[PDB]
Every structure is written in structure tokens, then in C-alpha cells.
Amino acid sequence: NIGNVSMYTVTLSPQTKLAEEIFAIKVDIASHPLATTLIGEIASYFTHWTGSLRFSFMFCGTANTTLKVLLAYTPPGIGKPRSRKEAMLGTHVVWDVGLQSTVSLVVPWISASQYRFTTPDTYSSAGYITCWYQTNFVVPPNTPNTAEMLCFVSGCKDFCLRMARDTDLHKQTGPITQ
Amino acid sequence: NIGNVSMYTVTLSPQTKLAEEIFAIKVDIASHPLATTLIGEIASYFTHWTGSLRFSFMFCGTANTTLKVLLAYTPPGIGKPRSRKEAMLGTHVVWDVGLQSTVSLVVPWISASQYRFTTPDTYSSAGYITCWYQTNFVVPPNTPNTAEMLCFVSGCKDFCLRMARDTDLHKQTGPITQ
Amino acid sequence: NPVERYVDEVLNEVLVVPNINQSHPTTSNAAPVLDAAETGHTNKIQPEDTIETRYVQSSQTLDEMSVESFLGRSGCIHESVLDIVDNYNDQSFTKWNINLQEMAQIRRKFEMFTYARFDSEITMVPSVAAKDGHIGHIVMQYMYVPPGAPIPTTRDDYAWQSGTNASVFWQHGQPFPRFSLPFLSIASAYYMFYDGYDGDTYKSRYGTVVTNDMGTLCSRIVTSEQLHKVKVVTRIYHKAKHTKAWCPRPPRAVQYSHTHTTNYKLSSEVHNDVAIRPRTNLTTV
Amino acid sequence: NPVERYVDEVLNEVLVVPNINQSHPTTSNAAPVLDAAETGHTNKIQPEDTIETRYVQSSQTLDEMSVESFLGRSGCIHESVLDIVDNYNDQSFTKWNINLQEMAQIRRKFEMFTYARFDSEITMVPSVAAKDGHIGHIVMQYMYVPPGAPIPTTRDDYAWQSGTNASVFWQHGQPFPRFSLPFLSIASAYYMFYDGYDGDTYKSRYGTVVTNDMGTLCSRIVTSEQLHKVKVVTRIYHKAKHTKAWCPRPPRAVQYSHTHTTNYKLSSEVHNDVAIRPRTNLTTV
Amino acid sequence: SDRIIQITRGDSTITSQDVANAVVGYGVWPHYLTPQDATAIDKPTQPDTSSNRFYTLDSKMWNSTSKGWWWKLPDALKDMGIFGENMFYHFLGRSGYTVHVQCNASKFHQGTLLVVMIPEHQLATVNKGNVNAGYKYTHPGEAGREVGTQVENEKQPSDDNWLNFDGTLLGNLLIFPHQFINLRSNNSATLIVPYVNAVPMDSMVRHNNWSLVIIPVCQLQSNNISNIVPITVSISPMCAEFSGARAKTVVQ
Amino acid sequence: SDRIIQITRGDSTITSQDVANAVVGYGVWPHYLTPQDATAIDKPTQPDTSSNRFYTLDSKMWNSTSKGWWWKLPDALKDMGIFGENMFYHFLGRSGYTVHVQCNASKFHQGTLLVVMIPEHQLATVNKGNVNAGYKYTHPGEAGREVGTQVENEKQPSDDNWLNFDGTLLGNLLIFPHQFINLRSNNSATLIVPYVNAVPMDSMVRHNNWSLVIIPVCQLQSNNISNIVPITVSISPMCAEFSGARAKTVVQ
Amino acid sequence: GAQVSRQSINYFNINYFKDAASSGASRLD
Amino acid sequence: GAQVSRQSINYFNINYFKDAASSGASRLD
Amino acid sequence: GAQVSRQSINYFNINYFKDAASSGASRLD
Ligand SMILES: Cc1cc(CCCOc2c(C)cc(-c3noc(C(F)(F)F)n3)cc2C)on1
């Protein structure tokens, strides 16, 4: 997918098994799927971060496609959840798709220390965001049997970065000439 | 002409074709025909310039010689005008020669940026000044069939120079000795 | 009490982040978590709206994230080399067409904004390598030649007199030279990007090269020819002071190729050209 | 509020240029664009009189165009050479008849006025070239010998005692020497030009050489003979401070030939001697 | 109702019964040049209702393989009535815009367009050294550029939508004024942008201030593919003013 | 001095050092349409300095046999900058004018031109029954019509200067706004005319409001005939305003 | 020259050169 | 010795040597 | 900027940089 706009969309569809997993990523602001986002890029110019993160999701199926999804945040000190039941025991939002296409899940600042390192460093690893099917993806006849979802990220009022440093998300391996 | 006082005069005379061109120069304060004028020499000790320029012309024919001339300023973003019609669509003064021998055309400051570079640099190239015959050069019998015109230049109340630098209108290629 | 203003400067507590207030369970038909990203606006929901929060007194401050702080650090923008190999007259002087495009580190930070207006602090770090064993007494001259002024073509060109240009003479063994420059543009802000040309034909130049002419930096070893050859490398550092920036933009994702242009190279396997790391699948953290 | 005066100095807004006011179409028998250059006066017409202008608030300032600014920058006025080749006693000292006529760059600026009165700031840049590999401990002495005082004829002449003359001793590795000099003329202003002689016969001298005697600058390497030979070049820079200038004049159009004289050389094709570039014809921009 | 809009400019009125609000770029509404920021001393011409009106560009067809489209302003409006004439007879111009992108389908169609207005979108060329995009490529006119079609001339700009045709990642385009046309929610996007530049007025011929970029982030799908789903763009200048009049510039 | 004049309009300034005052037609200075006399309800466009400026027409040569010249307004200004563009993109237009006729010779030349501005100069055809002057004949453009030259097509208007090309006597043209350029006295004529019509605005393409007629009543004589004595006309619209914008009308 | 202020904890905020470009980093907010 | 001035933003305009020729560039106007 | 105090034996207690980490050893008690 890298090199395509499809690297930005998650596909949903009618499931045959219940409570299936949709996606799972680390919540660390400068960790991998989210390092290249704007907040991830700026966070990469600083050594420490703190505050709550806001993840939003916009459903892009037809106006006749329905779906209920569970978005969960698993605080640290445990592995990523292996089932919807395990995931829903953490912080979560049950999203019902309807007239308003977008939902937001806030990953609260739940940490031992007041700040965490922006770079991938275990001790200050913030947990995971996983998405599961709450019910199913239902559609009437003659309607596309698959649909995309876009995912966004930004910082809440308490977001803050500290200790400026150079980034490792960009480099120079030769002279930049005229 | 260089090396003669005639490098300072433009010759006018009875024309056989209508609306002929008399002269055309760039309006840039430190550009070529006007680099050696006093304002051009001082402008050459600075990197930036701004403000309006005042061009004056003094007719030197006999008191019985008549003439109407169109002096035009063509703002940038277009080539120099190829005809009197094309030129008169820009800023212009129709000069009627009579008891007062001199006329002045003001080249208003019409620029994108607040200043321009004094040195010949396209982006900040200010346009052109062209002169054409509005009617003709008429004289009675027994009168010289040609006459000169002198051209002057100075700066208006808004003229201003900035960023001092060394000039390229003078050099030293060997020791100046006793 | 400005003095109070001064105390905040010393402790770096000028811009405080807000507190988290206590929230409670709710059951209503106002659903803040729901919205429409189509509007082009970010949902304004805060933690108190989704979970039940406790009251926490935020001490964090945003001073370090200010535009002044982000762009206010000296970074290298050029490395000048005067390497004496076999001809002192030809090798003891050089010139550089000034720009902030050759070093990726600082170029990328400035390019996170479309326009930026600032004063500059230039610091120079010269180092003399004794190729044959001795450096003698090295004295350098760095001269700023604004566009239009005469550029020196020999180590004794009359232009080195510096009758009007600014020159900084540095003597080996003295502190690193440093000076400030005011905002130099003919416009109100420097263009970090410029979607324009200098003409309307197929041969017109495109980009910041049309607007960012800063002149040339001419430098030479003032000392005359010495028996032992030296290689003098002068690194120029730049720092922005009293900064303002407008219209933020996406950070450069691929390597830079050339100055004044957004041109880039792309290989056969594109994931190597960007910092994005391939995920095994959607569910592998 | 002089303090207000100080703020203007810091921002360089002491001398403001006037605004352009809005003007309107006119039909009258007062024709400002018309005049007579014969009068020797410049027509005083402004843009509002010829075109219809809008109201624009001018922010430009003329501080940098002041005579203080124009003549207030250090330029090289001399390059002194003490080259030890084969006789330390003869080559370790020299002298220079002071003047501001040898370097075209600053000479031309000062010569844009007929008279000028100013104080001077002299800065010296010495550089020791190690011709054999070592510079040892170089200590220099620069002595100002006003007209009449005894000029040294050997490196140990009693005149180097400097019992009354001003001498500056510089030691290699210390900052560049610098000192100020007050306005030195016996008249009220320095003559940049002088249409006069020192007598009334065919052999009398003509020009500024009659009025601008400034004395001699005698210098020597204070250190005694060292095994390794050095070549010390001292460049003298001058800057005018607290300046006043009278009767402006046309800038020098051809190269200078000699000091204190307006003499010039002219070749067979004169357009090469002036900065005027040949036009193809009257209508070729 | 928060999902209806009527925009009146000059003699034109545009409506939409399924909007997602409107975006005012950088929060500044277009306004005329003030005497404190002005620099070119001659009195500006302000065509008013004759130039500040909606001009509808050529329609584009959105299909399952579309990669995007882009237009540059003021270039796209160069052959449009009085506004277009004014930009060629004058050296300088200044203007804000109301951009209204239109695209309707049905409740059984799905797809998403990211509509963005980028200031100073300096295009890149790919794998061509220091050769930059040529003038005629970045001045397509009202036809704009359909990403993924052009015959590789050398000065042809990048056609990589995921890298914003300029070396930065697509997902970050949201930092610029933008909206989405998500077929299940809305059928139009409205962006109102002020004049943004480092000088108060500029050449309308050599400099393009804004670029309208429309990229389909979610593929158009339905079970009635033979029905063509076009995308139409209508742009209205706002507070247009020109200065430094002369003969008409003829380009290329 | 009562014999000098400087007329500034937009970015143009015209001077003359030998005038015979100025004439303000019917004593009314040009002014914009007021809401009490207006009728077309849409808001007018007023180009201001971009259209209200002097436009110089093609020069004519006056010789011992010249019979006259005529131009019709606004037709003569149809290919003139912004004013010309505005008259074709709009259904309606309204405007006054400053007409400045220039002709200089010498103190040893003699001759007299009657310069007249006629409202509704409906031309006649001679000996052709009820066939009227054809559209292209009365719409010569900036080149006007040189009396006594044309190749007799049928719808060609009258070329009889003594009958004002309309069946009335020349000596009575003085009842219309006019001036004379008597070579021994002046070298220019200046007439400033308001908008005159029975409706507040009108089609700039189908209706010509004023006609500039220049007839040499006293033959040009001198003892240096090889020196050409041209006549140049410069016209400046005043208070030009247009209404009812649309696509550009293409004529003939 | 500089801006002395009092409360007693004076903040002599000196600017040593005569150009605005010469001073250090700007105050925030 | 130098000219302290007040408004509070003092402008200590110091002249470090005892000769007029020693001071820096002159004030304009 | 610093805290001038009076009794007359002033204690100009200067802090030359704009960061708290820059000052010397702390007062006791
Ligand atoms: C965009 C943008 C912003 C800027 C300002 C860059 C500052 O650039 C310089 C640099 C880096 C060095 C010198 C310089 N180096 O040495 C000298 C002197 F000491 F010789 F004056 N001047 C001058 C400028 C204008 O350039 N492009």
C-alpha cells in the first residue's frame, strides 16, 4: 500500500464471525503508523510529550450502510488485547454509524510520570488502540459490500511537547546542490 | 556618440509616416542608459530602491518650431510597446511644445513589492519609457529642419534607497601611485 | 508587573496549558464524540467529555513550542573550503551564493511554514588544517557582496577593499566571528515556497530562485603565501531571531535534491524513500 | 522625549519619507508638468499631479542615505609590506606618506563632495606570512610622524623612542589595533579638490597635494632578527565619524591614475574608459 | 437547517441542499487592500459585481480509477469574462475567492474527495535533476490537470498524489484550508479564502497564489457504474482589484 | 495664463500651450446615474481609472484638399483597453467624454477646423431611395471616416460636408457643442460632454450617442507644404459605467 | 540603553547595540 | 561619564573616553 | 536583571541569563 492513497483507509465488510478485529496500533505519538502524521512529525522534534490524544474516524460507506464499531484504548502494563471482551475492559467508545459520519475517541493521559519519551522506549510505551466489530456491517441489496474508514489524530487541550531535538524522520545522505 | 556631447541629445524632425517612435529605455534606476546619471550613480551604492521617478524633457528647436509628443510609461509584465497605440494604454503625458520648453513625466511607483533591486534582476524590472510623435514636427520655411531634445531624471518625494553596497560603475585595475 | 513578566521568562511559564476538570457519568442527547470531518474542522471534544476525569492541575508550559524557540537555534547552512594545493593565488579565495537550502536540517524546519519573517544571527566556525605541519598566522576575510556589487576575481581584486560592503576579519586564535543581519527582503516576508515564475514563457525560471536572491559571500585568506599549505574550512551557522511565520504546511517527506526546488527522486520500491515503515498487517502493532 | 529619539535610532526611523495622497481628475490652466529647465531648478511636480493616485502610507526612511552612513564604513586605504628577504636591518621597517587617495573605493565616495569635515577611526589588520615555517613572536610598532618630526632611517633610529609621537604596539595574537583621530586640518574642512597652487610660477604644484599633508606612518617589526623570515602585511582601514560634507559633485567616471590629481588616461576607443555601455540605437532597450 | 446554503455573488447564486458547513481559510474574510499595507501608488480599479461572480469551470468525470485533479488560481480564471480581461490588462491584481466544488451521486454510492486550497503550491518534478516544472504545465487554465494522463514532456510536474506533487505526504494536506465531499454526507464543499501573499498585490500572470487540489481518498463505488458522476467547480473572485493598467499581455 | 491647459484623467495627462478655453457641452459636467433616473436594477460596474483615461486614436493628415473626418462614440473606442472590453461584455453602458483634438503647424501656416460634437448624428444616404446607411459604415472604429475617399457601396452614407452628411447646412453646426482650431490662434480644442440620451443607459454596440465631426472650413495654406500637418484626437471616457454582464458580444 | 523596572527586584533589560536586529530572542505571547 | 534619561526605559548613552573623537557614529537630523 | 536591596549596603543579586538553571549555588535554609 505504501505509495498509494489506500495506505490511509481501513476496509470494513459483512463479517461471518462475530466480534472480529479491524486494526491495532500503538498509541505512542511518534511510534510507527502515526510517526508521519503532522502531530507525529512535530513530536519528533521534541524529546518528551504529555497530554491526551484525540483519534477520529470517518465512515465512507453509502448512506444506506450501517455499522457499530468498538474503539478501545488499552493502558500499559499488559499486552495488546486478543478479543473484543479483553479490549472493552479498557477505555472505549461504541460508535454507531449514522447521519454524522465521524466519531472521536480520546486517549486520556494515563501515565506514571508527568511526561513520556517521544521515541520508541519501552518504560514510557503508552498502550494500544484497537478497533472491533460491535455488531456487523449491514447493507441492503444492490449496495457495495465493502466500505472504507479514514483515521485522524490530533492533540487535546493538555497536549504538550518538551526538549527540542533533531528529527530522525528525515535525512540528508549527500550534498543538496544548485 | 559616446565621447561626445551628442550622446545627451535626441534628434527630432518632420516625419513622413505617422506615430513614429523616438526613443525607448528601461525605467530601472540603475539600468543602462540611466546608470551614469547622478541618481543612477547614487542608486548604484545601494541594493534596493523605491519611489517614483521624474523624467523631464527640454525642447531645443527654434521658437518657431512646433511639436506634440507622447511620453509613456509601460508597467511590467508585458513587452515594450510596439506602437503609439500600445504605448498610450499605459501611463502617459501628451507634451505640447510652446513657451515653456520643458515637460515632466512621472513614473509612479507601481510594484508588487515595497522595494526593487537596483541591479538588472528580471523579477524587479520596472517597465519602459517610450516616446512617440503625437502629431508632427512642423516648421515654417527657412528654419532648421531638425532639432534636439535633452532628457533629465531625478527622484520624487517618495524616492528612497536602501542597503549600502560597493558600486560596479567604477573600478581600480592597478595601483594608484604618487 | 512586567517584573512578574520577567519572572515568567526566567522559569519559562509564559504560556500555560489548561487544567483537566472533574467530569461525571452522563446520559444525554448531546453527543460531543459525534461530528463530521467533512466540515474541515477538528472535533473539539476534550477528555472530560468522553471519560470521567479527576481534577488535575496542569503545570506544563508551551514556551518551548513557540515559533521563536523552534526556529531559534543555530544550524549549519554552509561549509566553505579554501584548500591550498598547488597555486596560492587561485586557491586562497572563493565565493558562495547565499541561501538556506543546502543543509536539510534547518531547511526542513523553515519549510514548515509558507512565509517567515526574521532577523538572522550568523556565527562562523573556521578551522585550519595543517597539511604540511604549520599554520603560521592565518587571518581570514569574509565579505558580504549584496546583489549588484562587484565580485572579486583574484585574491587582490580591488573589491576586497570593502569600501562599502561589510567584511568581518577573523584572526586565528580569537573567538568565533558573529554578527546580526536585519530582515533583508524587498517584500514583507521571506518566501519559503513560491508558485511563480520570472516570466511567461517556457524558459522562465520557477520557484524561490526567482525571489530569494541574497547575494554572495566572498572570502579569502588575507595572509600572503606561506611555505606550508593549509586547508581552511569555515562552517556558517544561522539562527532566526524575532520570528514570525505564516501558513503552516506538511513536513518534507522525501530527501531534498536541489536548492530552491521541491524536486525529488523516487526509486523502484518507494517505501525506502519515505520514513513510513511497512506494517505486517492492520493488526500487528 | 529623547528616549523617543533613542527608540527611533534603534529602529532607524529618524528621517521618514512623506506619504502619497489621493488625487483626482483635473482640468485647469495650471500645468505643473510644464516648466523651464533653463532656470536651473528641478520641476517640483509629484505623482499626485500627473496621475490619479491612491492614498499610501509611506514607511521608508532615509537614515541609511545620510552622509554619516554613506561615509561611515571602514574601507582599506593602504597595504603596508615588510618583506624579510636578505637583510633584516633594511627590510624590517618602512614608511608611508598618509593620504586617502590610493584606494579607489573610498576615494570615490569622499570625492562626491568638495569639502568634508570628519573624525577618523583607524583599524589595522596585520598578517604574518611564515615564509620559512615559523613566525616566532612578532611585535609591531606603528608610529605617527606629523609633518616636521624626525623620520626614522634605521630600525634602531632614536625616533622610535616615540617620546612625543603616538605609537601603537601590537603583539601577534591580540585583537586588531584601533584608535581614533580628531579632525586634523589647519582649515575648517578637508579639501577633496583644490583649484590652486603653492606659488605663482610655472613650477608651482597644483592640487590637493598643496593642502593635504598629513604626515608619515612609520612602522617596524619590533622583534629582533629571527632565523625564519616572515612577510608582514598590514592593511589600514579608515572610517569617517561625525561627518559633514559640502558642495556635492559628479562621481569619478574614469579610473584614477595618481594621488592628489584628477588626471586620467584615455584610450583610442573611449567607450571602454567609462561605465557607459553602447546602445544599439535609440529604441533598443 | 445547518445543511443548506445559498451563496450570492454578483449576478450568480449557488445553492446546495447537502453541505458540511463552509470553511473560511485561516479565519480571515476577503477584504480590500488598506492604505497601510499598500505600496503601488496608483488608484486601483475595482470591477465589483462584474468580476466578483461565480465562474463555472469545465466538469470532470470521477470514476473508479481517478487519481485527482488540480487547478491553479488565478490562472484557472484567465479566460473568464471581465475578471480574466482585467488580469491581462494590468500588471498587478489582488483577490480572494469562494470555491464551491459540486459532486452528487446517490444514497447507494460511496466515495470521498479531499478538497484542498494550498497557498504557494510549488510543484516538483521527479527524477529530473534540477529541471523545474515548466510554465505551460502549471498554467493549464480552466481545464486543470487530470492526474495520471499526460505524455511525459521533460518539464512536466510530478503526478504523485500521495506525495502532494511536491514531496510531502497527502495525509498532512489537512493543515491547509480544506473540506471533504463524502458522498453519504454531502454533495458539495465550500471554501472561502482571503488573499494570501507576502506582498500586497502581485502579477496575476507570473504568480499563482492558490491551488485547488481534489484527490479521491476513497474510491467511487456503486452498483450502477454506467451513471457518470461528474465533479464541477465554480469559483467566484471576491474583492478583486487591479493596478498598473496598460496594453493587454499576450501569453505563450 | 488663459492659454494653457493640463487635463488629467486616470494615468494620462494632456497639455496644450495654445488653447481657446474649453467647452462643457450644454453646460452639464458628466456624472453617474442617480437612483431616481435609473431603471436597470442590477448594480453597475464602474471601472474608474482603468476606463476613464485618454485613448489616442489614429492620426489623420490635413492637406490642402481635405474635406473632413468623422468618428462616432462609443464606437471609436471599441478596441481601446478596459473601456472597450466593458462595452462588449455588457448589454448596457453609459459615459461622458473629454475630447481633445490636436493640430499644430506654425506661425506661417493658416487654416481652420470646425470641431463639433453632435448628439444623434443620424446619417443620410444620397439619391438612394429609402435605403439607409449600413451598420459597418457608421461603425468605422478608431480609423473614423475620411470624407471624400470611399468606394461607393450601396449603403454608404452621404459624403457632403456642406450638408452635414444629414441634410442640414454646415454653417448651423455651431448650435452643437463645438470649437475651432484656427491655426493662428490655437493648436487644440477641448470639449467635455455629458451623457445625452432619452434613456439612462443604452447598448454601446447598437447605439452611437455622439459623433465627432472635424471639417476644415478654411483651407490649410503655407509656403512649406512638404511638412505634413496631422490632426490627432484623444478621447477620455468620464464616469463610465456598465450593466447587464454576460459573454462577450462578437460583431459582424 | 535599557528599561529598568521596579517592585525591589529591578530587571535591567539592556540592548547593547543601536540596531533592533542586534538583540536576543524575543519575549513570547 | 554619560547621559541617563527616564520615562521607565533609561537610555544610558555612555562615552567611555575623554575625547569627542572617540565616540561612535553621530545621531541624525 | 536583578534584585537591588537597601539599608546603605546594596546587594545587587544579578542573574545574567534568562533561565533559572543558569544561576549559581542556591541560598540555604
Ligand atoms: C529565505 C532566506 C532567508 C535568508 C537570510 C539568510 C542569511 O544569510 C546570509 C548568510 C548566511 C551569511 C551572510 C554573510 N556571511 O558573512 C557575511 C559578512 F560577514 F561578510 F558580512 N555576510 C549574509 C547573509 C545575507 O536567506 N534566504
Ligand SMILES: Cc1cc(CCCOc2c(C)cc(-c3noc(C(F)(F)F)n3)cc2C)on1
Ligand atoms: C583629506 C584627508 C583626510 C585624512 C585623514 C586620514 C587619516 O589618516 C591617517 C591614517 C590613515 C593613519 C594614521 C596612523 N596610522 O597609525 C598611526 C599611529 F598608530 F601610529 F598613531 N597613525 C594617521 C592618520 C593622520 O587624510 N586626508
